[PDB]
Design an enzyme around this catalytic site. Structure first.
Site, mmCIF file in Angstrom:
data_model
loop_
_atom_site.group_PDB
_atom_site.id
_atom_site.type_symbol
_atom_site.label_atom_id
_atom_site.label_comp_id
_atom_site.label_asym_id
_atom_site.label_seq_id
_atom_site.Cartn_x
_atom_site.Cartn_y
_atom_site.Cartn_z
ATOM 1 N N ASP A 533 0.877 -1.190 0.020
ATOM 2 C CA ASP A 533 -0.011 -0.046 0.024
ATOM 3 C C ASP A 533 0.895 1.148 0.058
ATOM 4 O OD1 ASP A 533 -2.385 1.388 0.173
ATOM 5 O OD2 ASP A 533 -2.855 0.796 2.192
ATOM 6 N N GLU A 536 2.676 7.171 -2.709
ATOM 7 C CA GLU A 536 2.669 8.401 -3.335
ATOM 8 C C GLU A 536 2.922 9.500 -1.963
ATOM 9 O OE1 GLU A 536 -1.062 5.510 -3.651
ATOM 10 O OE2 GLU A 536 0.060 6.630 -1.768
ATOM 11 N N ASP A 598 -9.386 3.555 -2.232
ATOM 12 C CA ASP A 598 -10.474 3.954 -1.229
ATOM 13 C C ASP A 598 -11.515 4.620 -1.548
ATOM 14 O OD1 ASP A 598 -8.167 3.007 0.539
ATOM 15 O OD2 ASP A 598 -7.516 4.817 1.075
HETATM 16 O O1 LIG Z 1 -8.701 4.116 5.685
HETATM 17 C C1 LIG Z 1 -7.377 3.719 4.966
HETATM 18 C C2 LIG Z 1 -6.964 5.137 4.213
HETATM 19 O O2 LIG Z 1 -6.872 6.076 5.452
HETATM 20 C C3 LIG Z 1 -6.386 7.473 4.725
HETATM 21 O O3 LIG Z 1 -6.227 8.190 6.066
HETATM 22 C C4 LIG Z 1 -5.054 7.349 4.134
HETATM 23 O O4 LIG Z 1 -4.731 8.414 3.629
HETATM 24 C C5 LIG Z 1 -5.057 6.152 2.831
HETATM 25 O O5 LIG Z 1 -3.778 6.188 2.313
HETATM 26 C C6 LIG Z 1 -5.621 4.855 3.665
HETATM 27 O O6 LIG Z 1 -6.014 4.071 2.467
HETATM 28 O O1 LIG Z 2 -3.536 -1.973 10.280
HETATM 29 C C1 LIG Z 2 -2.609 -1.816 9.417
HETATM 30 C C2 LIG Z 2 -2.925 -0.382 8.587
HETATM 31 O O2 LIG Z 2 -4.199 -0.527 8.248
HETATM 32 C C3 LIG Z 2 -5.074 0.862 7.623
HETATM 33 O O3 LIG Z 2 -5.445 0.590 6.401
HETATM 34 C C4 LIG Z 2 -4.488 2.189 8.214
HETATM 35 O O4 LIG Z 2 -4.394 2.965 7.111
HETATM 36 C C5 LIG Z 2 -3.035 1.997 8.967
HETATM 37 O O5 LIG Z 2 -2.737 3.307 9.659
HETATM 38 C C6 LIG Z 2 -2.964 0.902 9.640
HETATM 39 O O6 LIG Z 2 -1.791 0.847 10.334
#
Ligand SMILES: OC[C@H]1O[C@@H](O)[C@H](O)[C@@H](O)[C@@H]1O
Ligand SMILES: OC[C@H]1O[C@H](O)[C@H](O)[C@@H](O)[C@@H]1O
Ligand SMILES: OC[C@H]1O[C@@H](O)[C@H](O)[C@@H](O)[C@@H]1O
Ligand SMILES: OC[C@H]1O[C@@H](O)[C@H](O)[C@@H](O)[C@@H]1O
Ligand SMILES: OC[C@H]1O[C@@H](O)[C@H](O)[C@@H](O)[C@@H]1O
Ligand SMILES: OC[C@H]1O[C@H](O)[C@H](O)[C@@H](O)[C@@H]1O
Ligand SMILES: OC[C@H]1O[C@H](O)[C@H](O)[C@@H](O)[C@@H]1O
Ligand SMILES: OC[C@H]1O[C@H](O)[C@H](O)[C@@H](O)[C@@H]1O
Ligand SMILES: OC[C@H]1O[C@H](O)[C@H](O)[C@@H](O)[C@@H]1O
Ligand SMILES: OC[C@H]1O[C@H](O)[C@H](O)[C@@H](O)[C@@H]1O
Ligand SMILES: [Ca+2]
Ligand SMILES: [Mg+2]
Ligand SMILES: [Mg+2]
Ligand SMILES: [Mg+2]
Ligand SMILES: [Mg+2]
Ligand SMILES: [Mg+2]
Ligand SMILES: [Mg+2]
Ligand SMILES: [Mg+2]
Ligand SMILES: [Mg+2]
Length: 1059
Positions: A533, A536, A598
């Site tokens: 993940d 960017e 997302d």
């Molecule tokens: O819920 C997960 C998402 O949280 C956001 O705050 C982040 O910017 C995203 O990168 C992420 O996929």
């Molecule tokens: O739990 C693994 C990760 O998953 C979630 O998507 C959150 O964006 C991150 O803060 C967290 O650490």
């Protein structure tokens, strides 16, 4: 107390920091403003600028108060305007009551202006490259444009404004006609016409058809320079007619056709409103035009594609550069045999999709809330109890949420100097007492598992021993990027993982260290890849990587260096490992699956996801997924869930997911939880139908996956990719091709049940019920919430893994190493051929061919040697006999009998399919169906007016018949294709007339005839009368009416067209 100015701030494309220079990179004539801050807010402050212009000290510029915010005062200093060539160096200063001066700088900028190509003065043909020596519209450079061929149908242009760089060699299969006014470069696939004065290029196909051309007024090609040692941008401009459509540009959420927009090639993490902001995680400087070419700008720097957004007949690209005058502009104009071949040529340049193991193409299950062994066991138990045979499993909330390489609650002795741990170093506790055992249970369930990762070392200021040790080591080794001053680069404070230290994936030693920390997860825990993940995360103008490149060049490339590094590493240990990522640029396709990121659980998001998949496809990212029905927001409605499920089952990668870490009630997008949240039990059987159908189609889907890897043909494609000339296919975003032969039309509008489907040329057959639809028009398909319109192309040969029930939507399980009943569904039309990827039997290519000869009442199938028993399902009327290698095979009266037989045939009257079973043989087998005609056109599937259908008299074909059809204004209309071109034909009319002789009136393309239908013994007895008709090529309108002079009731079963 302090002062601060930083001209570029974070160099964010979309926003500015409040202490930047504007413009960031000034051009001639632009007023230059410096935004400066001081703190605290206090009376008696003075802010000013000390500076030089071309080395000469200027009078100091005094800044003026702008506004106060928080603990700070903001000021503006106006440097005025400058001329091309000016070199400005400044230092900003602040003081209070003439005391200690705080300062920022020195900073330098070089003022630029555009120079363009004027004329070609000479042409040198070097055999593998052509040099065009040129003049410029301004300045003292002597530019050179180099032309070369990546292949005979793929032209490369390399521009050196100063003429000091040389282009690359290409193929030599070209000839040149050089004259005083023009140079024409020809290959067997292209004709490139270049006017010399002024310079102007047109690219044509060999036969002369124009693909594109530089803008009419010429001086189209240019560079932005100070005239000394800085080149900051490049551009070219092209003429475009008002109907030209532009596809691709990576993964786009707003529209599949970018005409009218300025498209930014800039990766960005935009949560939920990608469509509205026109942002994306995956940006590629490549587009495909329906005018039959692609254009690829070969650079990782940000580029803006102005697609008839400024002038209605002009498109342009503006490519940034870091100043380096030795970086040439490099772009390609790509032709090919068809639109998919264009994409293949693009992948020759930037990399082929890497074939993934078959498990990647089954259902993936995921939920952020799954964060302990008991969640995993319940997930697996629920899937089994609900007959959901998934193949992928994702864990996100698995780690300590600190190092991201150690299991949550694990204890251990911390390691210094970046030393890697092995499984035995840990004491597993709490949420994960036996990670290896947990993985073993997932494998036991027939699934493979991936773990979530990020490319950044977290640093939120809290103390955490192992993370602190790792940070110290990473900094001492220079494994981070450099901020431009010698300190490690950190993600900007306000961003996701703000303050975290990015791992420099351009640094091999850094990559070796980072991955070594995860090694035990593959070698000992036994995982099957990573969900990589983010990425960017590269900002700052001066940010510097180990390869010498800076932030401008590296922002778009970084995510793909990251994703590729992990993909390769995982695969080096576990050949079956798969990556699941969201961010990248050109080349992303080499390294696993990409999901659309997302989005909320709405139909608007669904629509955006579909556009993201179709655009990604054109751009060479074929192995694409999305969080079906959305991963966040209010829980999806049963309607959305069902609609999303259907599209997802017919998408390249099928995966459910959810955002919440610990919600109550559960947020899982699983079918069992969807039933629980919505109260709609019917969700489960609908989800099962689609999952089971996907698994029935797995042989076809996996062969399509191989076709992507070998031939650049994406799995899911926007209609204009296959039909670029078809004006009705240009803007379609609610239907698509899946594999070579299926047309899928998901319902992506809330409340919709009448679905429009544009059918291109040829005949299209509903794969669920056998309804025949001639092409070249938009049909309306009634689709309830459980129904998905899917049609097979004429001549299609589709491999399927079927149960003994032989229906689509019957559970065959998730066994990836054997077939149950390997079946080939065939829609005969002329001569067709299919190459099946038999991965179960060693990855052998099985070449199947079908020769349709209804004119002589025959369909022939040439079956190659097979390892397994094979079942053909041929769309046709019922044979009078079937032979294999000339020997008759026995007619089975029932499905049970067919299943018991070793060879034979059976006719399914409901689907109008002839089943043929052939034994496994190590030699080709010639199968022939005799006495067969094109499948019937079922009356119950015709256009009906004031008449209804029924099924209450046995003996009909299809699902039933049109009942009564016995009053004026009642009509049944058919769309009938001429089986072999314009000709007379015989039309069989099958009906019952239990009471008395009947008559009906038929119109064939408006030409009337009355037909007599003699009485049948009763309503349980059918008869067939033959009617002579004259049909034109293609679709023919055949209307049956009950007119004032007609008589009697009939039940109307179908019509068959034959010689
Ligand atoms: O819920 C997960 C998402 O949280 C956001 O705050 C982040 O910017 C995203 O990168 C992420 O996929
Ligand atoms: O739990 C693994 C990760 O998953 C979630 O998507 C959150 O964006 C991150 O803060 C967290 O650490
Ligand atoms: O040297 C002259 C500079 O000194 C500062 O103390 C003043 O406030 C500036 O406005 C001035 O340009
Ligand atoms: O702690 C001092 C801080 O004060 C703020 O008002 C400034 O804008 C920061 O840049 C500075 O670091
Ligand atoms: O159309 C091309 C032009 O686009 C504008 O937005 C840029 O600011 C110019 O520098 C460029 O010449
Ligand atoms: O211009 C408004 C104010 O700006 C700054 O805060 C100066 O220190 C102060 O002297 C002035 O009054
Ligand atoms: O506050 C963050 C903490 O959250 C949880 O307790 C994790 O188990 C732990 O590893 C982490 O330090
Ligand atoms: O890394 C932070 C801490 O993580 C775990 O709790 C370890 O058992 C402990 O030794 C260590 O200090
Ligand atoms: O494809 C045959 C038919 O299938 C379904 O019955 C659809 O509701 C209908 O619109 C379509 O014509
Ligand atoms: O009038 C025509 C009707 O006659 C009888 O009632 C038949 O049972 C019915 O199937 C048919 O449509
Ligand atoms: Ca029928
Ligand atoms: Mg003052
Ligand atoms: Mg729309
Ligand atoms: Mg090629
Ligand atoms: Mg949980
Ligand atoms: Mg393994
Ligand atoms: Mg270094
Ligand atoms: Mg033929
Ligand atoms: Mg059997």
């Amino acid at each position: 107390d302090g002062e601060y100015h930083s001209p570029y701030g974070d160099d964010d494309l979309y926003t500015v920091q409040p202490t930047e220079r504007s413009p960031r990179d000034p051009k001639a004539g632009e007023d230059v403003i410096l935004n400066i801050t001081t703190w605290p807010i206090e009376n008696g402050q003075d802010v000013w600028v000390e500076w030089t212009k071309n080395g000469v000290a200027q009078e100091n510029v005094t800044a003026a108060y702008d506004y106060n915010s928080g603990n700070n005062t903001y000021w503006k200093a106006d440097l005025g305007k400058f001329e091309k060539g000016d070199e400005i160096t400044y230092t900003t200063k602040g003081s209070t009551n003439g005391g200690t001066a705080y300062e920022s700088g020195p900073f330098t900028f070089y003022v630029t202006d555009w120079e363009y190509v004027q004329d070609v003065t000479s042409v040198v043909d070097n055999g593998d490259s052509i040099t065009l020596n040129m003049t410029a519209t301004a300045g003292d450079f002597s530019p050179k444009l180099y032309l070369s061929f990546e292949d005979l149908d793929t032209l490369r242009m390399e521009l050196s404004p100063t003429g000091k760089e040389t282009g690359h060699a290409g193929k030599s299969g070209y000839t040149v006609e050089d004259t005083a006014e023009k140079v024409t470069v020809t290959t067997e696939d292209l004709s490139i016409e270049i006017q010399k004065s002024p310079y102007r290029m047109e690219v044509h196909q060999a036969d002369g058809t124009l693909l594109t051309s530089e803008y009419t007024t010429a001086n189209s090609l240019g560079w932005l320079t100070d005239g000394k040692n800085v080149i900051n941008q490049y551009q070219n401009n092209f003429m475009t007619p008002s109907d030209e459509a532009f596809y691709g540009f990576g993964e786009r959420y707003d529209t599949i056709n970018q005409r009218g927009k300025d498209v930014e090639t800039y990766v960005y993490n935009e949560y939920q409103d990608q469509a509205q902001t026109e942002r994306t995680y995956l940006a590629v400087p490549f587009f495909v035009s329906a005018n039959k070419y692609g254009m690829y700008v070969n650079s990782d720097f940000h580029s803006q594609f102005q697609m008839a957004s400024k002038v209605e007949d002009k498109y342009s690209f503006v490519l940034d550069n870091d100043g380096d005058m030795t970086n040439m502009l490099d772009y390609y104009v790509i032709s090919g045999k068809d639109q998919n071949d264009i994409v293949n040529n693009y992948t020759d340049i930037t990399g082929k999709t890497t074939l993934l193991p078959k498990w990647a193409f089954g259902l993936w299950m995921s939920a952020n809330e799954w964060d302990r062994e008991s969640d995993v066991s319940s997930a697996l138990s629920n899937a089994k109890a609900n007959d959901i045979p998934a193949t992928g499993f994702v864990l996100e909330q698995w780690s300590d949420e600190e190092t991201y390489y150690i299991w949550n609650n694990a204890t251990y002795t911390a390691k210094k100097n970046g030393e890697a741990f092995s499984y035995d170093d840990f004491t597993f506790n709490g949420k994960w007492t036996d990670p290896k055992g947990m993985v073993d249970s997932v494998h036991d369930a027939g699934m493979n598992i991936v773990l979530w990762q990020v490319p950044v070392l977290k640093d939120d200021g809290t103390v955490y021993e192992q993370r602190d040790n790792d940070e110290e080591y990473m900094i001492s080794q220079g494994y981070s990027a450099d901020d431009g001053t010698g300190a490690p680069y950190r993600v900007p404070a306000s961003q996701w993982f703000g303050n975290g230290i990015l791992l420099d994936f351009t640094n091999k030693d850094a990559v070796d260290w980072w991955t070594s920390q995860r090694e035990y997860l593959l070698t000992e825990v036994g995982i099957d890849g990573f969900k990589t993940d983010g990425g960017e995360m590269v900002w700052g103008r001066d940010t510097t990587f180990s390869n010498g490149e800076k932030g401008q060049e590296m922002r778009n490339r970084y995510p793909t260096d990251y994703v590729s590094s992990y993909f390769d590493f995982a695969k080096s240990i576990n050949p079956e490992a798969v990556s699941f990522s969201r961010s990248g640029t050109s080349g992303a396709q080499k390294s696993g699956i990409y999901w659309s990121g997302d989005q909320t659980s709405t139909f608007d998001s669904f629509q955006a996801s579909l556009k993201a998949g179709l655009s990604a496809s054109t751009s060479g990212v074929s192995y694409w997924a999305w969080d079906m029905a959305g991963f966040t927001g209010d829980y999806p409605t049963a309607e959305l869930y069902k609609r999303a499920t259907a599209m997802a089952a017919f998408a390249p990668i099928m995966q459910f997911h959810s955002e919440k870490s610990d919600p109550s009630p559960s947020e899982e997008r699983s079918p069992w939880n969807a039933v629980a949240r919505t109260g709609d039990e019917t969700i489960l059987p609908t989800f099962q139908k689609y999952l089971y159908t996907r698994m029935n189609l797995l042989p076809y889907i996996y062969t399509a996956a191989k076709d992507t890897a070998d031939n650049g043909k994406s799995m899911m494609r926007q209609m204009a990719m296959d039909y670029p000339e078809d004006v009705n296919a240009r803007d379609l975003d609610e239907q698509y091709m899946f594999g070579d032969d299926l047309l899928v039309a998901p319902i992506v509008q809330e409340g919709q049940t009448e679905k429009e489907v544009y059918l291109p040329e040829g005949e299209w057959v509903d794969i669920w019920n056998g309804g025949v639809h001639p092409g070249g028009e938009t049909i309306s398909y009634y689709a309830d919430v459980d129904t998905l319109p899917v049609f097979a192309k004429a001549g299609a040969i589709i491999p399927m893994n079927m149960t003994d029930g032989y229906q689509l939507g019957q559970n065959v399980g998730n066994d990836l190493k054997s077939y149950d009943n390997l079946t080939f569904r065939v829609y005969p039309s002329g001569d067709s051929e299919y190459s099946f990827y038999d991965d179960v039997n060693g990855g052998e290519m099985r070449d199947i061919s079908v020769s349709e000869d209804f004119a002589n009442e025959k369909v022939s199938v040439d079956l190659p040697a097979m390892a397994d028993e094979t079942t053909m399902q041929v769309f046709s009327t019922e044979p009078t006999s079937v032979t294999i290698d000339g020997a008759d095979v026995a007619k089975a009266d029932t499905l049970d009998a067919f299943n018991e037989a070793t060879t034979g045939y059976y006719y399914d009257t409901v689907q109008n399919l002839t089943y043929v079973k052939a034994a496994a043989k190590d030699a080709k087998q010639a199968i022939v169906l005799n006495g067969v005609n094109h499948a019937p056109y079922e009356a119950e599937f015709g256009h009906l007016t004031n008449v209804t259908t029924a099924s209450d008299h046995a003996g009909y074909t299809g699902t039933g018949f049109v009942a009564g059809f016995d009053a004026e204004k009642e009509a049944v209309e058919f769309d009938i294709d001429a089986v072999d071109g314009a000709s007379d034909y015989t039309m069989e009319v099958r009906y019952s007339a239990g009471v008395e002789d009947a008559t009906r009136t038929v119109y064939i393309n408006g030409k009337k005839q009355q037909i007599t239908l003699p009485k049948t013994a009763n309503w349980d007895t059918w008869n067939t009368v033959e009617v002579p008709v004259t049909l034109q090529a293609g679709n023919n309108q055949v209307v049956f009416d009950f007119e004032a002079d007609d008589t009697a009731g009939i039940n109307f079963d179908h019509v068959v067209i034959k010689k």
